[PDB]
Design a protein around this ligand. Structure first.
Ligand SMILES: [Cu+2]
Ligand SMILES: [Cu+2]
Ligand SMILES: [Cu+2]
Ligand SMILES: [Cu+2]
Ligand SMILES: [Cu+2]
Ligand SMILES: [Cu+2]
Ligand SMILES: [O-]
Ligand SMILES: [O-]
Lengths: 439, 439
């Protein structure tokens, strides 16, 4: 096949993407070994769904797992009566998700399980896939002529030909695996045919962070989780926390082989040590560096000029309320809290008004990084750690290091009950989630 | 007695004001006639209570009326568990109100009934009195040396030696009376002994407005409902809506007699006419001019200089929420609404957080003036009708003409359930009231 493996794409046809996917234990070849994973559509990752604004999506999910499951349409500003985080599809049963893709939308999104208490093992086992919303912006020459690829960043650990089970330490830290894969492949080679690459990036890992850097090259950020920036932003590196997406342009500068690496990053994961009276928690420190893929540039690369503009960011109405949400930890209990409470599906934590704008101040009072995710209502990150964000774009996950406060501008869109939670999914399963009702 | 009648004063003693008042039908002489009014302490108005910050008030109210009653400590930022708008004292029963006067407080306040559905007739019949909080500011020479008087502005109508009953039109408009009185007196004469007067003004009428003007003189506003301004403000006239208070300095310019008048003012009261197929509502138009009192200046008046400063207004924290409250009317039904609803003592309308600041936008979509009152939590009026307020001071009633929006900065103080309502008390009785819970 193609030197660079990417998930098979399923495209809408005549404005309709109608598809049946099964969630199923699936024997497959992975990183040179045979393993049984849990997959959508018989593959890992699941198929990439490619749609345009105003398309209808009709996705029937058949549950062939021995436990209940559901789907979260991560990042899609649709109704929480469709993207329903409380729905359970029992084993053997099916459910059809039907929605219209919003008109003002573009970027890389994804789908995965969201059944409280069971997300971490289901996602770790291989249940996830991408969804791309194509834009009229993709037709401008500076993007149209680029070579485009999707990179699904997901790690895995295998034991006895199956996903490794969660340990107690895994529930505390979030589980990371030794197999650090791209599109389910181990350090694939991307032999570029064009000098400009457009890469859609997705961190679909449970807990692993990717401090991305391409040898000898900057990256040009053109989209965040939920939409384009207003103009390209040059960066030396790009951190992708669990659940985040980004799109970058790469402008290959000369012939040769360039490594795309996940550089060392300390997210505050913890170990245990005993030093003669100890038996106490100790930092794991930074991750070991990982090579994600080998990028081979073509001969005499002459990259395209960058687009001078992308999409203007909407002018939002003045906000009508300010919220404060404080994240804390009980590491040894592996319990995680928002404003001193654990999730309760029956309890409403915030009540807001549709079509108003709110300011959310999310403060991390723990020692671990926590990537904070809000369903249904994409937000504009104003600042984090007291540093203004260097661009305007829609996001739906924001990483907070220990001590940091993020200030978000949150326009409330669809009415209904939905959730916000840490996207280290073990933390969500262990209580770090709350309920927002919009009316 | 003294040419100028004022209510008898009861002062705290050794930091305690302990007093038993009875609410009772009382035969008395009023405006040259005998009448039976409902009074506190056997007088109309009731006694003026004079206290200082940190004083303890222990007021036992004995109800000798044939119906239930209670007290509202209008303007006092104390606990709604003391100033309890839901409490009922049955006929024959007593209740003791006990509270400490807040440290940062000064001005003219008042007490009157607040039993929903019965306020208008009880207040109209004579149940009200003033409460003055003395300040260390009263010791500055420019105030200490002034001649001070309280003016309780209250009108009345008599029928068969008793307060005139409410008609249906009265419930729609709010009841006004033909006897326009000051301290229960008909056009008293104030023979000034000093060239500078300090006048504490209280509008204790059900619905009548007083567009105040002193012939040939400006007034110098030094306090609003709930506290001093930052510096004196010269005005040509001063409108006092029902429930409002103000304190002014008068600087008598030459010898002679000067009328203090209530100038014509159109608050949007309505009548009914039939012109050959009519039978429809028609504006009453402006009130007829009234003389309130005769002010006689002394010989060769040489007024004191004005104080250069009064009290600095507190710097408030940034607000955390913006509220919108819309007032509407059904005149022919005499029903009055806030955000489309009538009062329900069981329903909580707004929930706020103690020690935060809110912005309240109150919009009058009716045709009548409505004076909006909030219990427990004094506010800073930022603007009304899109015009910035010309001073900073604590208020607790704000008048809105037809169409006007008032923008208020509302620091939430004591926790508990309290109310906000129109202070045309007929309108409150007929539904124009809502519930705020602070936690
Ligand atoms: Cu997600
Ligand atoms: Cu977390
Ligand atoms: Cu979620
Ligand atoms: Cu009042
Ligand atoms: Cu009113
Ligand atoms: Cu009241
Ligand atoms: O999620
Ligand atoms: O009141």
């Amino acid at each position: 096949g193609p030197s660079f493996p990417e998930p098979k794409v399923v495209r809408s046809q005549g404005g309709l993407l109608s598809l049946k996917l099964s969630a199923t234990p699936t024997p497959l070849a992975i990183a040179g070994q045979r393993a049984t994973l849990l997959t959508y559509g018989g593959s890992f990752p699941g198929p990439t769904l490619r749609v345009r604004p105003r398309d209808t999506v009709r996705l029937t999910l058949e549950n062939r797992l021995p436990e209940p499951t559901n789907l979260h349409w991560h990042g899609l500003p649709i109704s929480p009566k469709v993207d329903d985080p409380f729905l359970e599809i029992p084993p053997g049963e099916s459910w059809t998700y039907e929605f219209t893709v919003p008109k003002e939308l573009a970027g890389t999104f994804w789908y995965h399980p969201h059944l409280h208490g069971r997300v971490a093992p289901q996602l770790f086992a291989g249940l996830l896939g991408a969804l791309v919303v194509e834009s009229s912006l993709d037709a401008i020459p500076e993007l149209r002529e680029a070579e485009e690829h999707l990179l699904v960043l997901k790690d895995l650990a295998l034991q006895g030909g199956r996903p490794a089970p969660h340990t107690p330490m895994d529930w505390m830290n979030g589980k990371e695996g030794d197999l650090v894969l791209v599109n389910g492949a181990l350090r694939p080679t991307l032999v570029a045919q064009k000098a400009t690459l457009r890469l859609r990036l997705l961190n679909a890992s449970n807990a692993r962070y990717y401090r991305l850097a391409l040898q000898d090259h900057p990256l040009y950020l053109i989209a965040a989780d939920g939409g384009f920036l207003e103009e390209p932003l040059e960066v030396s590196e790009l951190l992708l926390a669990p659940g985040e997406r980004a799109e970058v342009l790469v402008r290959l500068r000369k012939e040769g082989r360039f490594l795309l690496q996940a550089l060392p990053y300390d997210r505050g994961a913890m170990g245990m040590m005993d030093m003669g009276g100890m038996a106490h928690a100790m930092p794991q420190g930074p991750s070991r560096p990982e090579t994600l893929l080998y990028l081979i540039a073509p001969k005499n690369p002459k990259p395209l000029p960058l687009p001078k503009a992308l999409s203007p960011f909407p002018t939002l109405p003045a906000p009508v309320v300010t919220r404060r949400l404080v994240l804390t930890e009980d590491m040894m209990a592996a319990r995680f809290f928002i404003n001193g409470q654990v999730f309760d599906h029956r309890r409403v934590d915030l009540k807001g008004q549709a079509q108003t704008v709110e300011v959310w101040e999310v403060e991390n009072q723990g020692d671990m990084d926590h990537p904070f995710h809000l369903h249904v209502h994409p937000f504009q990150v104003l600042s984090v750690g007291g540093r203004p964000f260097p661009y305007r774009a829609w996001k739906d996950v924001v990483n907070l290091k220990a001590g940091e406060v993020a200030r978000l501008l949150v326009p409330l869109r669809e009415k209904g009950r939905t959730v916000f939670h840490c996207h280290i999914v073990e933390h969500e399963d262990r209580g770090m989630m709350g309920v927002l009702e919009v009316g």
